[PDB]
């Protein structure tokens, strides 16, 4: 029952729900079964960066993920987000673990949305940038097991005292202000997001992944969305 558009960094291959047989980046439109994927050579324990871009003229949601000293991965999907999402949304980060586990640490997150109207003074914009996260980060809405401030970072899923990731965990952080992504006088609407993340696991098979997502403003974690559902979807439809 929420509406979800997401870019997933999916670390575990669930081949019965359509994943390819390797870690991958994907574009999810109202379903965990990605509309488009690309292979991702995820590196356990290294800091990675993902970038997400869209605009209402081209109507193409694109993402790129990379690590220093490595080649990038990229995915794009043609989708008119004015037909999928409401006029006002919230934007956020989500991650989960299941039987298999990893840390889902966010070290920085930035976002910019712009609406240009046909007026003389055309520009409307929202921008935020976090390069550290406090214990009490009042402009984020934390859901589930998400916490901020441990080492100045945002830990989307549970990590024990000694730094070990926990299984069967799910958490999200959403920016506190609603974001206006369509307006009747806008001639161009666009957005960009970037986040840096550290996925580490003591295991040879980490799971489940991190996603950037855009949702209805009152979105909440679906019941039972640990593991393969990434904190985003109530089922694998
Ligand atoms: Ca998966
Ligand atoms: Mn997937």
UniProtKB/Swiss-Prot annotation:
The mature chain consists of residues 164-281 followed by 30-148. To form a mature chain the precursor undergoes further post-translational modification after removal of the signal sequence; cleavage after Asn at positions 148, 163, and 281 is followed by transposition and ligation (By formation of a new peptide bond) of residues 164-281 and 30-148. This maturation (circular permutation) relies on the legumain AEP1 activity and leads to an increased stability of conA after heat stress and at various pH. Homotetramer. A carbohydrate binds at residues 99-100, 208, 228. GO terms for molecular function: D-mannose binding; metal ion binding. One of its GO terms (biological process) is regulation of defense response to virus. This is Concanavalin-A. Ca(2+) binds at residues 10, 12, 14, 19, 208. The keyword Metal-binding applies. D-mannose specific lectin. Displays antiviral activity and therefore may contribute to defense against infections. InterPro entries: ConA-like_dom_sf, L-lectin, Lectin_LegA_CS, Lectin_legB_Mn/Ca_BS, Legume_lectin_dom, Leguminous_Lectin. Keywords: Antiviral protein, Calcium, Glycoprotein, Lectin, Manganese, Mannose-binding, Metal-binding, Plant defense, Signal. PANTHER family: CONCANAVALIN A-LIKE LECTIN FAMILY PROTEIN, LEGUME LECTIN DOMAIN-CONTAINING PROTEIN. Mn(2+) binds at residues 8, 10, 19, 24. SUPFAM superfamilies: Concanavalin A-like lectins/glucanases. It holds the Pfam family Lectin_legB. Binds one manganese (or another transition metal) ion and one calcium ion. The metal ions are essential for the saccharide-binding and cell-agglutinating activities.
């Amino acid at each position: 029952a929420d509406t979800i558009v997401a870019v997933e960094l999916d670390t575990y291959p669930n081949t019965d729900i359509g994943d390819p047989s390797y870690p991958h980046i994907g574009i999810d439109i109202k379903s965990v079964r990605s509309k488009k994927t690309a292979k991702w050579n995820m590196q356990n324990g290294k800091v990675g960066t993902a970038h997400i871009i869209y605009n209402s003229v081209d109507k193409r949601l694109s993402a790129v993920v990379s690590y220093p000293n490595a080649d990038s991965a990229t995915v794009s999907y043609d989708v008119d987000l004015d037909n999928v999402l409401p006029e006002w949304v919230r934007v956020g980060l989500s991650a989960s673990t299941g039987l298999y586990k990893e840390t889902n640490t966010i070290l920085s997150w930035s976002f910019t949305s712009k609406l240009k109207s046909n007026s003389t003074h055309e520009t409307n914009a929202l921008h935020f940038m976090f390069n550290q996260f406090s214990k009490d980060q009042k402009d984020l809405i934390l859901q589930g097991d998400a916490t901020t401030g441990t080492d100045g970072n945002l830990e989307l899923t549970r990590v024990s005292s000694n730094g070990s990731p926990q299984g069967s965990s799910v958490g999200r952080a959403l920016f506190y202000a609603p974001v206006h992504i369509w307006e009747s006088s806008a001639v161009v609407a666009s957005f960009e997001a970037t986040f840096t993340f550290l996925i580490k696991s003591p295991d040879s098979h980490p799971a489940d992944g991190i996603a950037f997502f855009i949702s209805n403003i009152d979105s909440s974690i679906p019941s039972g969305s640990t593991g393969r559902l990434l904190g985003l979807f109530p089922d694998a439809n």
